[PDB]
Amino acid sequence: NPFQFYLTRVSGVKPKYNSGALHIKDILSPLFGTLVSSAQFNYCFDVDWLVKQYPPEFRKKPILLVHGDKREAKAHLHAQAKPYENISLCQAKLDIAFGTHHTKMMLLLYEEGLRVVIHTSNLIHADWHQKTQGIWLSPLYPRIADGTHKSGESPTHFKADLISYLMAYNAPSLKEWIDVIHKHDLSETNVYLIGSTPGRFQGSQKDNWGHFRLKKLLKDHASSMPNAESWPVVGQFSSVGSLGADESKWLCSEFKESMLTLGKESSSVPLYLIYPSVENVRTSLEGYPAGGSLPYSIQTAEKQNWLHSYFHKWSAETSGRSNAMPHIKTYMRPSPDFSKIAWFLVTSANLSKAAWGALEKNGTQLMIRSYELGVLFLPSAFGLDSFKVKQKFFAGPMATFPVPYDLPPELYGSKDRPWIWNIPYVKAPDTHGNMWVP
Ligand SMILES: O=C(O)c1c[nH]c2c(Br)cccc2c1=O
């Protein structure tokens, strides 16, 4: 397989569903390289747990935690890290209201080279225990010889784009990592970076981030096919923002319009949204506590009941993960019979204006509140016209893409309700015998 897309290990499924999965201990293992220094970009951190995931011989190597916490949350994080002399912190600036630092990324500097990991898990025990999470593993990037002048750039522009993303933080600790990346050869990378950074982007910068970045990539590096209007759009996420009073406000006006783009030329495209139902959560491996990581509030949901008619249950027999609640977020473009896909994106971005951006100032400015990061798999980057969908995620011409959940997606039944985390569920107990009383 050339894609290097993995799921995290799930405690409680049979070994056959964990064979090709990765735990954080595997990612940080000496088998992957001899660690010199690392940066951990994330949202939530359990520092005691995190240090224990590094191999004993690597636990005093420098670690940088890149986070978005302010005030008391910021002090708690500093207090967590203070016992560890080798840990530095970098507070990502969040100058727009209600923004968050959601990007999940590891920069791993070895003696042998550099690795980049873009993933979907927080750095806490429960995110790696019984959830469905995604990981993209870069190749080992070798150092460019001192005195040798080459770009080290890939056909997907990954090196320039990763540096651009880091430069947006305007942070001294990340300028060091930028200089590290400059010195390595990233030319083997076959994925495109899609990031969000907070700001108001106009003119040349409008295409740099969020759903306009996605649109630009699909315009330039994907091809439109006959009957493209029949190829659905699938979005799969663990949280929903306030999208407005009807679908025309954002979801189907600008978001879907970016996601529908294919090729350079100029809607009834079906849109499937996958989001766990209450029953999905109740019968999950974790039980109702899995809903602690699906933070859809009743306040938001009651303003957009129109949205729930797009919702499809979580189902993942293909990877043995129907009862491992999703914290991965994915977006893709399958064929009408779901046997191939025009592209696939794995990201930290949920279905929200905060993450993807919303147009302002008469359509001339893209406003983004949050930091997010994902990678886009395009067939053209692999010498292909489309990807065949892998029938079983862990089974087996290794040019078929491992989609981690079942297709086609199954619509909510009439008795189903979207998981809403701040209301009680006292009708039926979960897999541990408990109810949900927020
Ligand atoms: O980006 C992330 O990983 C997350 C961000 N916010 C969350 C909230 Br608010 C409540 C529960 C879980 C998460 C979460 O997982």
Side-chain angles (χ1 to χ4, degrees), residues 42-44 100-104 120-122 124 127 131 133 238-239 290-296 327 329 348-350 371-372 421:
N42 216 293
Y43 172 69
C44 190
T100 58
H101 184 265
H102 282 151
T103 291
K104 299 186 178 68
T120 67
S121 304
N122 294 278
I124 67 191
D127 266 41
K131 297 194 187 299
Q133 307 266 25
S238 52
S239 194
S293 297
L294 301 161
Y296 194 26
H327 190 263
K329 299 94 176 141
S348 62
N350 278 310
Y371 296 85
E372 316 273 354
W421 74 331

Short mmCIF file of all heavy atoms in Angstrom, two decimals, residues 42-44 100-104 120-122 124 127 131 133 238-239 290-296 327 329 348-350 371-372 421, ligand 1:
data_model
loop_
_atom_site.label_atom_id
_atom_site.label_comp_id
_atom_site.label_asym_id
_atom_site.label_seq_id
_atom_site.Cartn_x
_atom_site.Cartn_y
_atom_site.Cartn_z
N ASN A 42 -1.54 19.58 19.52
CA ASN A 42 -2.79 18.92 19.86
C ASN A 42 -3.74 19.90 20.52
O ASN A 42 -3.47 21.10 20.62
CB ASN A 42 -2.54 17.69 20.74
CG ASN A 42 -3.51 16.57 20.40
OD1 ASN A 42 -4.70 16.70 20.64
ND2 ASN A 42 -3.01 15.49 19.79
N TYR A 43 -4.88 19.37 20.94
CA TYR A 43 -5.90 20.14 21.64
C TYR A 43 -5.86 19.83 23.13
O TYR A 43 -5.63 20.73 23.95
CB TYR A 43 -7.27 19.80 21.04
CG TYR A 43 -8.41 20.39 21.81
CD1 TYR A 43 -8.62 21.77 21.83
CD2 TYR A 43 -9.27 19.58 22.55
CE1 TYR A 43 -9.66 22.33 22.55
CE2 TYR A 43 -10.32 20.13 23.27
CZ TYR A 43 -10.51 21.50 23.27
OH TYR A 43 -11.55 22.05 23.99
N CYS A 44 -6.02 18.57 23.49
CA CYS A 44 -6.03 18.13 24.88
C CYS A 44 -4.81 17.26 25.16
O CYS A 44 -4.46 16.39 24.36
CB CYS A 44 -7.31 17.34 25.18
SG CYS A 44 -7.53 17.02 26.94
N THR A 100 -10.18 27.65 18.33
CA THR A 100 -9.55 26.57 19.07
C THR A 100 -8.33 26.10 18.29
O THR A 100 -8.25 26.29 17.07
CB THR A 100 -10.52 25.39 19.27
OG1 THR A 100 -10.94 24.94 17.98
CG2 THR A 100 -11.76 25.82 20.04
N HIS A 101 -7.39 25.45 18.98
CA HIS A 101 -6.26 24.80 18.30
C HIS A 101 -6.56 23.30 18.23
O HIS A 101 -6.25 22.55 19.16
CB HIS A 101 -4.94 25.04 19.01
CG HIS A 101 -3.76 24.46 18.28
ND1 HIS A 101 -3.25 23.22 18.58
CD2 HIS A 101 -3.01 24.95 17.26
CE1 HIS A 101 -2.23 22.96 17.77
NE2 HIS A 101 -2.07 24.00 16.96
N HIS A 102 -7.14 22.86 17.11
CA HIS A 102 -7.57 21.47 16.96
C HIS A 102 -6.57 20.59 16.21
O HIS A 102 -6.73 19.37 16.23
CB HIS A 102 -8.92 21.40 16.25
CG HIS A 102 -10.08 21.73 17.14
ND1 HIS A 102 -11.25 22.29 16.66
CD2 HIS A 102 -10.24 21.60 18.47
CE1 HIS A 102 -12.09 22.46 17.67
NE2 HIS A 102 -11.49 22.06 18.78
N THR A 103 -5.57 21.18 15.55
CA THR A 103 -4.58 20.42 14.77
C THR A 103 -3.90 19.34 15.60
O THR A 103 -3.44 19.60 16.72
CB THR A 103 -3.52 21.37 14.23
OG1 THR A 103 -4.11 22.19 13.23
CG2 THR A 103 -2.31 20.59 13.61
N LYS A 104 -3.84 18.13 15.04
CA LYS A 104 -3.20 16.99 15.68
C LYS A 104 -2.07 16.50 14.78
O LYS A 104 -2.31 15.92 13.71
CB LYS A 104 -4.24 15.91 15.99
CG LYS A 104 -5.26 16.52 16.96
CD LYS A 104 -6.26 15.57 17.47
CE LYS A 104 -7.16 16.30 18.46
NZ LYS A 104 -7.98 17.29 17.73
N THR A 120 -5.76 12.27 14.32
CA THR A 120 -7.02 12.81 14.82
C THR A 120 -7.22 12.63 16.32
O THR A 120 -8.27 13.03 16.83
CB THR A 120 -8.23 12.18 14.08
OG1 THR A 120 -8.33 10.79 14.40
CG2 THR A 120 -8.07 12.28 12.57
N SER A 121 -6.26 12.07 17.04
CA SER A 121 -6.44 11.76 18.46
C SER A 121 -5.84 12.82 19.38
O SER A 121 -4.71 13.28 19.16
CB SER A 121 -5.79 10.43 18.83
OG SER A 121 -6.28 9.39 18.03
N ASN A 122 -6.57 13.15 20.45
CA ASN A 122 -5.99 13.92 21.53
C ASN A 122 -4.96 13.07 22.27
O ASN A 122 -4.95 11.84 22.16
CB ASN A 122 -7.06 14.39 22.53
CG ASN A 122 -8.03 15.38 21.91
OD1 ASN A 122 -7.75 16.58 21.82
ND2 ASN A 122 -9.19 14.87 21.48
N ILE A 124 -4.48 11.83 25.18
CA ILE A 124 -5.03 11.32 26.43
C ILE A 124 -5.36 9.85 26.21
O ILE A 124 -5.58 9.40 25.09
CB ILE A 124 -6.28 12.11 26.90
CG1 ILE A 124 -7.46 11.88 25.93
CG2 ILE A 124 -5.98 13.60 27.02
CD1 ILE A 124 -8.63 12.81 26.14
N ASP A 127 -8.58 8.62 24.11
CA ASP A 127 -8.64 8.80 22.66
C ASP A 127 -7.93 7.68 21.90
O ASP A 127 -8.21 7.51 20.71
CB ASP A 127 -8.06 10.15 22.27
CG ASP A 127 -9.15 11.23 22.16
OD1 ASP A 127 -10.05 11.24 23.02
OD2 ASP A 127 -9.13 12.04 21.20
N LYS A 131 -11.68 4.19 20.49
CA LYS A 131 -12.26 5.07 19.48
C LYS A 131 -11.76 4.70 18.09
O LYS A 131 -10.70 4.08 17.93
CB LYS A 131 -11.93 6.55 19.79
CG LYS A 131 -12.52 7.02 21.12
CD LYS A 131 -12.49 8.53 21.24
CE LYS A 131 -12.92 8.98 22.66
NZ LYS A 131 -14.32 8.54 22.96
N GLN A 133 -10.00 6.26 15.17
CA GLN A 133 -9.13 7.40 14.92
C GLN A 133 -8.28 7.11 13.68
O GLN A 133 -8.00 5.96 13.38
CB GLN A 133 -8.18 7.68 16.12
CG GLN A 133 -8.89 7.84 17.47
CD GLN A 133 -9.18 9.31 17.81
OE1 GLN A 133 -9.30 10.14 16.90
NE2 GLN A 133 -9.32 9.63 19.09
N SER A 238 -17.25 14.19 14.24
CA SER A 238 -17.66 13.90 15.61
C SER A 238 -18.29 15.08 16.32
O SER A 238 -18.66 14.96 17.48
CB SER A 238 -16.47 13.37 16.43
OG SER A 238 -15.36 14.22 16.34
N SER A 239 -18.46 16.21 15.63
CA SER A 239 -19.08 17.39 16.22
C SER A 239 -19.69 18.22 15.10
O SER A 239 -19.25 18.14 13.95
CB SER A 239 -18.06 18.23 17.00
OG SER A 239 -18.71 19.18 17.83
N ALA A 290 -18.56 7.59 25.81
CA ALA A 290 -18.05 7.93 24.48
C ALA A 290 -18.65 9.25 23.99
O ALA A 290 -17.99 9.99 23.25
CB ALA A 290 -18.36 6.83 23.48
N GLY A 291 -19.87 9.56 24.42
CA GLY A 291 -20.51 10.81 24.06
C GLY A 291 -19.85 12.03 24.64
O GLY A 291 -20.13 13.15 24.18
N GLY A 292 -18.99 11.85 25.65
CA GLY A 292 -18.18 12.96 26.13
C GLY A 292 -17.27 13.53 25.07
O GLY A 292 -16.82 14.68 25.19
N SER A 293 -16.99 12.76 24.01
CA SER A 293 -16.13 13.20 22.92
C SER A 293 -16.91 13.48 21.64
O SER A 293 -16.33 13.54 20.55
CB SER A 293 -15.05 12.16 22.64
OG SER A 293 -14.21 11.99 23.76
N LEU A 294 -18.23 13.64 21.75
CA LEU A 294 -19.09 13.98 20.62
C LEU A 294 -19.90 15.19 21.09
O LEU A 294 -21.09 15.07 21.41
CB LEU A 294 -19.98 12.80 20.23
CG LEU A 294 -19.26 11.50 19.82
CD1 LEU A 294 -20.19 10.30 19.90
CD2 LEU A 294 -18.70 11.61 18.41
N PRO A 295 -19.29 16.38 21.14
CA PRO A 295 -19.86 17.50 21.90
C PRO A 295 -20.88 18.33 21.11
O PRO A 295 -20.72 19.54 20.92
CB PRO A 295 -18.61 18.31 22.27
CG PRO A 295 -17.68 18.09 21.12
CD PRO A 295 -17.93 16.68 20.63
N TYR A 296 -21.96 17.69 20.68
CA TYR A 296 -23.08 18.36 20.02
C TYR A 296 -24.08 18.77 21.10
O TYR A 296 -24.66 17.90 21.76
CB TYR A 296 -23.73 17.41 19.01
CG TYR A 296 -24.68 18.01 18.00
CD1 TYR A 296 -24.59 19.35 17.61
CD2 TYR A 296 -25.67 17.22 17.42
CE1 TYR A 296 -25.48 19.87 16.66
CE2 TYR A 296 -26.54 17.73 16.47
CZ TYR A 296 -26.44 19.06 16.10
OH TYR A 296 -27.33 19.54 15.16
N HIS A 327 -13.80 9.31 16.40
CA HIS A 327 -13.24 10.64 16.61
C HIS A 327 -12.41 11.07 15.40
O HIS A 327 -11.96 12.23 15.34
CB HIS A 327 -12.40 10.65 17.90
CG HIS A 327 -11.97 12.02 18.33
ND1 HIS A 327 -10.72 12.53 18.03
CD2 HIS A 327 -12.60 12.98 19.05
CE1 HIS A 327 -10.60 13.74 18.55
NE2 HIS A 327 -11.73 14.04 19.16
N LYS A 329 -12.29 12.26 11.48
CA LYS A 329 -13.16 13.04 10.60
C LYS A 329 -12.69 12.80 9.18
O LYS A 329 -11.49 12.86 8.92
CB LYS A 329 -13.12 14.57 10.90
CG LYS A 329 -13.58 14.94 12.32
CD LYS A 329 -12.40 15.03 13.28
CE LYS A 329 -12.87 15.49 14.65
NZ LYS A 329 -12.14 14.77 15.72
N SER A 348 -8.61 16.88 11.17
CA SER A 348 -9.14 17.24 12.47
C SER A 348 -10.41 18.08 12.36
O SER A 348 -11.09 18.27 13.37
CB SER A 348 -8.08 18.02 13.27
OG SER A 348 -7.74 19.24 12.60
N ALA A 349 -10.76 18.57 11.17
CA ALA A 349 -11.85 19.53 11.01
C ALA A 349 -13.23 18.86 11.10
O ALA A 349 -13.57 18.00 10.28
CB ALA A 349 -11.72 20.24 9.66
N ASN A 350 -14.04 19.29 12.08
CA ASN A 350 -15.43 18.87 12.18
C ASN A 350 -16.29 19.68 11.21
O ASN A 350 -15.80 20.51 10.44
CB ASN A 350 -15.93 19.00 13.62
CG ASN A 350 -15.53 17.82 14.48
OD1 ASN A 350 -15.75 16.68 14.11
ND2 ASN A 350 -14.92 18.09 15.64
N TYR A 371 -7.41 26.44 14.23
CA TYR A 371 -6.32 25.71 13.59
C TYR A 371 -6.82 24.29 13.35
O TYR A 371 -7.37 23.66 14.26
CB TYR A 371 -5.09 25.64 14.50
CG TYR A 371 -4.42 26.95 14.83
CD1 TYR A 371 -4.86 27.75 15.88
CD2 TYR A 371 -3.30 27.37 14.11
CE1 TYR A 371 -4.21 28.95 16.20
CE2 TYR A 371 -2.66 28.56 14.40
CZ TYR A 371 -3.10 29.34 15.44
OH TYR A 371 -2.43 30.51 15.71
N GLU A 372 -6.66 23.80 12.11
CA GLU A 372 -7.01 22.43 11.75
C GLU A 372 -6.00 21.95 10.72
O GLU A 372 -5.38 22.76 10.03
CB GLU A 372 -8.42 22.30 11.12
CG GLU A 372 -9.50 23.08 11.83
CD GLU A 372 -10.13 22.30 12.98
OE1 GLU A 372 -9.78 21.12 13.13
OE2 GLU A 372 -10.96 22.87 13.73
N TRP A 421 -24.89 15.79 23.57
CA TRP A 421 -24.16 15.34 24.76
C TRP A 421 -24.69 15.92 26.06
O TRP A 421 -24.43 15.34 27.12
CB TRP A 421 -22.66 15.62 24.65
CG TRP A 421 -22.24 17.04 24.80
CD1 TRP A 421 -22.95 18.16 24.51
CD2 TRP A 421 -20.96 17.49 25.27
NE1 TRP A 421 -22.21 19.28 24.78
CE2 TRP A 421 -20.98 18.90 25.24
CE3 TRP A 421 -19.80 16.84 25.71
CZ2 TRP A 421 -19.88 19.68 25.63
CZ3 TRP A 421 -18.71 17.61 26.11
CH2 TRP A 421 -18.76 19.01 26.06
O1 LIG B 1 -10.58 18.65 18.57
C1 LIG B 1 -10.83 17.81 19.47
O2 LIG B 1 -10.19 16.73 19.51
C2 LIG B 1 -11.92 18.10 20.49
C3 LIG B 1 -12.32 19.42 20.68
N1 LIG B 1 -13.26 19.76 21.54
C4 LIG B 1 -13.87 18.81 22.28
C5 LIG B 1 -14.86 19.22 23.20
BR1 LIG B 1 -15.28 21.11 23.33
C6 LIG B 1 -15.52 18.28 23.98
C7 LIG B 1 -15.19 16.93 23.85
C8 LIG B 1 -14.21 16.53 22.95
C9 LIG B 1 -13.54 17.49 22.15
C10 LIG B 1 -12.54 17.10 21.24
O3 LIG B 1 -12.25 15.95 21.12
#
